[PDB]
Amino acid sequence: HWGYGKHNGPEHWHKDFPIAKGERQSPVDIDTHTAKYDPSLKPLSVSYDQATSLRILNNGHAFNVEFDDSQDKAVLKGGPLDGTYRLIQFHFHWGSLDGQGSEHTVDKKKYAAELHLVHWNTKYGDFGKAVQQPDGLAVLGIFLKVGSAKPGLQKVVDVLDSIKTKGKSADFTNFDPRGLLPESLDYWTYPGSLTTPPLLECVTWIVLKEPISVSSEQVLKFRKLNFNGEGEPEELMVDNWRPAQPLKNRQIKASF
């Protein structure tokens, strides 16, 4: 199936997912000179004080920290959005080296990693219905650079041990996502898609200007994960990022 290797990588995704060549693909390079300041864009509203994390799972392409979205406990609203979006899960994309790992690029600059906070439009009732709508999902994208440790990320780091291989899961309660947020909420927004198959063009991307820094030892731990299932030949989970796609007919707006 699809993956990130030279034989099943992003360059091959179109064969099974023709929308890989669609008009609103993600990620893209954020050219800051061309992005347009939109004074009509409201401030982001992040309400995560009632967030209920449940578990973490190695899905074979990343590790997802899953949230209870049966009620409006952790929501995203405002910015360029109309309505309430509920947090379903958060995951990352990282590199084999500190010089790459992010999906989105700013002036072609790649970061060490990229965090994606996935939310679905509550007017569609379920995540699976939201995925059939142009305004179905809202993804908060946060860049990671190597520097000082991110205090807030250590519980995630520490549990990786336990979900080393694909299909493995561990209980993961009382994790507060607020500890992964940069100080500033300034952002860039554009209409896009999922970055992995099925690549559905249902996303409203919100990529924060300010990166969060993490230590070298923290990102090191992410690189110890495996794409493979237990008892299979070891393949380190590294470089699980999709390169920039053509902006085509779109406008990147800035909140600042």
84 is in an annotated binding site: no
User: x/- binding map, residues 100-119, to Zn ion, per CB under 5 A?
Assistant: ----------------x---
Catalytic residue selected from 7, 33, 61, 104: 61
Bin 54: left if φ > 0, else alpha if -120 < ψ < 50, else beta. Answer: alpha
7 is in an annotated binding site: no
- In this structure, what token pair is assigned to residue 252? 């990147």
Would residue 61 show up in a list of annotated catalytic residues for this protein?
yes
Which of Zn ion, Hg ion, none interacts with 116 (beta carbon under 5 to 8 A by kind)?
Zn ion
Q: How far is the CB of 231 from Zn ion (least distance, A)?
A: 27
CA distances 179 to 31, 119, 132, 173, 182, Å, are: 28, 18, 31, 15, 8
189-228: which residues touch Zn ion (CB under 5 A)? 195
185 vs 202, beta carbon nearer Hg ion: 202
116 vs 221, beta carbon nearer Zn ion: 116
**Residues 6 or more apart whose Cβ sits within 8 Å of residue 48:** 74, 75, 87, 176, 177, 178
Q: How far is the CB of 194 from Hg ion (least distance, A)?
A: 9
Catalytic residues: 61
Q: Which residues of this protein are in contact with Zn ion, per CB under 5 A?
A: 116, 195
Binding residue numbers for substrate: 195-196
Binding residue numbers for Zn(2+): 91, 93, 116
